[PDB]
Design a protein around this ligand. Structure first.
Ligand SMILES: [Fe+3]
Ligand SMILES: [Fe+3]
Ligand SMILES: [Fe+3]
Ligand SMILES: [Fe+3]
Lengths: 339, 339
């Protein structure tokens, strides 16, 4: 069913965002949703290379950090690398096969490209602060606390792609596979898409900004400044990324794109809320691991958990969800200088 | 079977290029094949925006062209747009799911990103030379001569992806689907990959350079100079693209990556040769359409067909194939100024 160039001459302005006729001609003179066009332009205007940031000073800082402050910084840096390793590949393998409008197709691909620059910047930092980078990269796969968030986040992607395959190959209806019962449903497939986008919105808008705060806390003490300068560029990119998933969710929810999405977006509003909750608690439990051996000036388990609730409320309000925590003010306002 | 983050701690240096364990951690301190790393760096170093090229002068040239010279330029520009519309999305949807080494995964994604810039540049040109861009973009889908090359090139992609889905969901062996006989084979799946890469190598290394010559022929007469300046940047990118598919083919063929690929690369050497032949003839027949209503100073059906054979020999020699045409010198040496 899927084609890398659909031969039908369709009006791309009336196609839905997802599950419509796959995009054939890539044109940029017209947009159904002009937000994705200007996200492309903003992201292109922000193009930066990791190597233009001097991280050479961060080796001295890192060796001077006490062992627990090393553990805080390295554990936070490894989580960032795991996160954008998944964000490097997943938007292309998962969203691209489903897009039916050209402006969104290009943004998803530009979005994923920006994540490879983020991934390369993490290598740049690691190479310049530790003696053996292999130890860092290998722990990312074999860290018990890291594998928890890793397999949960990827499942929203994998379940979408595996069901994408059943749909492109069979279509709707109940099918038989070696005697097994396979019932492919379009509503169930787009149910897995909406949830996936909700998960990715929490990843970029909530989980990553927890790490930014941890990275800038070192910057506030005038430590790991090369690292912080890079995170400043990552953060400015992340703002575009969460904005994109925000409009995608709101447009599908409003029924203007797909009216069938409106009913599905309400039917799964509970599990969307519950997803953001589990993500927030997972980040709280992560702070217990970060400060397992102690804390540092400007950041501890308590202060960070307040920033989790603070940012979680904001992001959930922008996607039309109810707030799960007390409406409180910013516990670390110094972070706004870096954003 | 596919996962956006494989949880096994594997030595990414010993993984094959394709069909191995999917990449988990994205690291850039080490490379199995360092060619893909330096292709990433070169492509990043070439980053350019379509809008920094002044095409405003090309509207006057285009309106001054006689009707057949309009037809030559517009037909060539539409083919370029069709070509890079497919190259915008296909490398991500088709190759990325199969890559098992991080340096190749990122290059495929950077490669596809550069193609979106190419696609955006074609819109930039079209917007500035014609009154109604819709007529141009709509003909790309509904052009009898364009649909010929369109459905042929995409088939190498689509057949690979559709079989990718059967393999990730079932694995090797014979399966039953609603009573139908489905026999998934790993050798057959990687047979469709090698051929696909051969097709994409001809696309970028042979078909596109036929269009470059047509575009620079206007530049030689001092016409459509904004257009030509952009094609200069496209061409410099295309050289990296064909180089990447060249190493991918040679490495698989040599058996150093996958020894099983070596035997398959020889077993399908005939259909690889035949594929490059059909592509060359398709480009020749295209020149009959380009110069259907007449020719122009510096380029006609005869001269272009000589450049087809000339470039086809070179590209086939670099992928270890036999030469199908007479070994002759460059018929349009002025093109080297633009490359
Ligand atoms: Fe990122
Ligand atoms: Fe991001
Ligand atoms: Fe291109
Ligand atoms: Fe290319």
């Amino acid at each position: 069913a899927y084609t890398t160039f659909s031969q039908t001459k369709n009006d791309q302005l009336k196609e839905p965002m997802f599950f419509g006729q796959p995009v054939n001609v890539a044109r940029y003179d017209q947009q159904k949703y002009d937000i994705f066009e200007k996200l492309i332009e903003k992201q292109l205007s922000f193009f930066w290379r990791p190597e233009e940031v001097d991280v050479s000073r961060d080796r001295i800082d890192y060796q001077a950090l006490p062992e627990h402050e090393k553990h805080i910084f390295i554990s936070n840096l490894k989580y960032q690398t795991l996160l954008d390793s998944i964000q490097g590949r997943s938007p292309n393998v998962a969203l691209l096969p489903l897009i039916s409008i050209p402006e969104l197709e290009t943004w998803v691909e530009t979005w994923a490209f920006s994540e490879t620059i983020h991934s390369r910047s993490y290598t740049h930092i690691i190479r310049n602060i530790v003696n053996d980078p292999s130890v860092v990269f290998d722990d990312i796969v074999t860290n018990e606390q890291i594998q928890k968030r890793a397999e949960g986040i990827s499942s929203y992607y994998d379940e979408l792609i595996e069901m994408t395959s059943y749909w492109h190959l069979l279509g709707e209806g109940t099918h038989t596979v070696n005697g097994k019962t396979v019932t492919v449903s379009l509503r169930e497939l787009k149910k897995k898409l909406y949830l996936c986008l909700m998960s990715v919105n929490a990843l970029e808008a909530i989980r990553f900004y927890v790490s930014f705060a941890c990275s800038f806390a070192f910057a506030e003490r005038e430590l790991m400044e090369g690292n912080a300068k890079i995170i400043r560029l990552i953060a400015r990119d992340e703002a575009l990324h969460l904005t994109g998933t925000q409009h995608m969710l709101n447009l599908l929810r409003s029924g203007a794109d797909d009216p069938e999405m409106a009913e599905i977006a309400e039917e799964c509003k509970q599990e969307c809320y519950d997803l953001f909750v589990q993500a927030a608690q997972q980040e709280k439990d992560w702070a217990d691991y970060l400060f397992r051996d102690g804390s540092m000036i400007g950041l501890n388990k308590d202060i960070l958990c307040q920033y989790v609730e603070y940012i979680t409320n904001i992001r959930m309000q922008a996607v039309g969800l109810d707030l799960p925590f007390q409406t409180r003010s910013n516990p670390i306002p110094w972070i706004n200088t870096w954003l």
